Symmetry: C3
Subunit: 252 residues, 3 copies
């Protein structure tokens, strides 16, 4: 059987495919560990700038594999359910088709950007069973869409589509079913044209800044900016611009 997580490098893009189509890409031990390792690979390899996560067979992820867990498999890695608890540092785009409920929705929420087929289905249903979502969905959904919409969805546990969520800026690209990956690939290419460390540092500032004291916010930002300003890539950006040619990025 093919690997349950596929990993393919396309220039500065790392394409991560959950590959259990007959289980709608539910997260068992091999998927959780494979996704954690992809995150590590993305962040540790200089010639990568961005990742895309997607699912084989027109479904993204049914969430935790309850059957695998009940048999005795560990579904959590060091980064949580795949990487829900500790998403990667470098930018990652979720390319979502079809079923993406529950842990699948929480995995989507751990990503930075979302490209989705219009029929793609999301949800945080835990309260229906007298449970509460614990893989970050409650920490993040209320910051991606309007507070009262997120609250409604979390309290009713109802499903919602990419098509419905597009008005709230939760869907960076809304396309026809079947188009999410090719669209994600284009968006990734727009990002990887830019300075590798600069796109990473930008993300970092955006995530960390909502934790900073206003008194310190500019100094904290400045700490992250400094290495960028003196990077080799920053030199090449200016040089390439003067010379009317494409920059050649190195990630240093």
């Amino acid at each position: 059987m093919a690997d349950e997580v596929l990993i393919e490098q396309r220039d500065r893009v790392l394409l991560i495919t959950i590959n259990r189509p007959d289980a709608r890409n539910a997260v068992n031990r091999a998927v959780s560990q494979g996704l954690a390792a992809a995150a590590d690979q993305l962040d540790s390899s200089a010639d990568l700038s961005v990742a895309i996560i997607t699912g084989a067979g027109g479904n993204f992820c049914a969430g935790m594999d309850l059957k695998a867990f009940v048999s005795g498999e560990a579904v959590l890695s060091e980064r949580g359910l795949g990487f829900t608890n500790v998403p990667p540092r470098k930018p990652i785009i979720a390319a979502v088709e079809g079923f993406a409920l529950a842990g699948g929705t929480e995995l989507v929420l751990s990503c930075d950007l979302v490209v989705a087929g219009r029929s793609a289905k999301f949800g945080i249903p835990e309260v229906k069973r007298g449970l509460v979502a614990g893989a970050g969905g409650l920490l993040r959904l209320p910051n991606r869409i309007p507070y009262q919409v997120a609250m409604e969805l979390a309290l009713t546990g109802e499903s919602f589509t990419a098509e419905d969520a597009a008005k709230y800026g939760f869907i960076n690209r809304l396309v026809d079913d079947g188009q999410a990956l090719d669209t994600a690939l284009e968006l990734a290419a727009k990002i990887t044209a830019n300075g590798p460390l600069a796109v990473a540092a930008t993300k970092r500032i955006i995530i960390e800044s909502a934790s900073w004291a206003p008194e310190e916010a500019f100094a904290k930002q400045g700490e992250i900016l400094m290495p960028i300003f003196v990077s080799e890539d920053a030199k090449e950006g200016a040089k390439a611009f003067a010379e009317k040619r494409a920059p050649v990025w190195q990630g240093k």
Copy 2:
């Protein structure tokens, strides 16, 4: 009759401000009765959700100024009714007609909003040289886009349910007079679910805004633990697997 009416319908507490002739302004009896309602909601295991609405087609005109001026102690230990310490369990505002000033701050202390199309909101304090102090400024810029909340707070202008629907401030937008009926359906969607679960989900959504990132999952975990050992959690798994409805206890 009583200036605040309280009615239990299974797991729903219906709370009605009952001063229609005063457009349901908050005097001492109202503020105290709303605070007492919040206590009853939060202390009663057989309640999961509340709905707050106003008698006679208006929600709440805010602070009763005649009461304030005549020396009534209008603020309760939870603020203007419960603006400052809102209930722990989920609550829905069912808003018709006039909902200005303190009334808008009362709406903003709720979690979800069902409104008649013509319902009127606003934070008009600056027009009188005052500042809104019952939570409006702390919450409105987190419920609609920052610059829209800023604008509304600085001009003091009124805005309707219809205008605000565009920003995700209105969970259900209904023909005028239908807010309570629609809130009762929305409430039933939530009371269908685990009582402890819906309260804890709300709790995490609220308190997460002020957690250090590096401690967010640990803080969250402290709220989840009592849930995963709850009797409702066990009943939810057994009810699903026996293809029947769950019978909740709030334990």
Copy 3:
């Protein structure tokens, strides 16, 4: 050569105009200092309640003047690029036409309200040169429009129009090109109609509340509120309302 920053008072409104249209109103030292001193004037003058900032000759601001930086001008003032890092205490409206990229966009984000001509062009393009935007755009854009859209624009560096951005609440008044100043003045008058101290304190609570611990938020608000309750304007506001006459504010 005219002043690089024009300043005009209309009743309680301070109109601040960046005046280097030859350079598309790029910020050199003269502009940065002019802008900082205009902020100071707004905040220290009791008979002012609100400002409007705009650019002469049909664009807002091209951002940092590169010729100036390169040659050695100390462009950053005490308040940043003009006043990006420490904006005015009192409310300020950006009246934006035409080119408003990079530093210009961050200047806009340092204001509280935006009125823009529909073809106005914003952007945070630093990543394209292997740089990161450092004048507050990354601290602020994600709180004005949806998180993932801000993240996207930050990572792509892609320009966006006022027309595009209006759906997100980033544009308080979207108007035809050429009408931004006129409309900003009408909005400013709607604000100056209200208590000067009350509008400033309202802005302060909105900004600073973002960083208060919940259990202290009402007490901290209480501190900013106390001076308002006992203010002379508070009395005047109630008596003018009672009488249904224009209140005459004093700023105390």
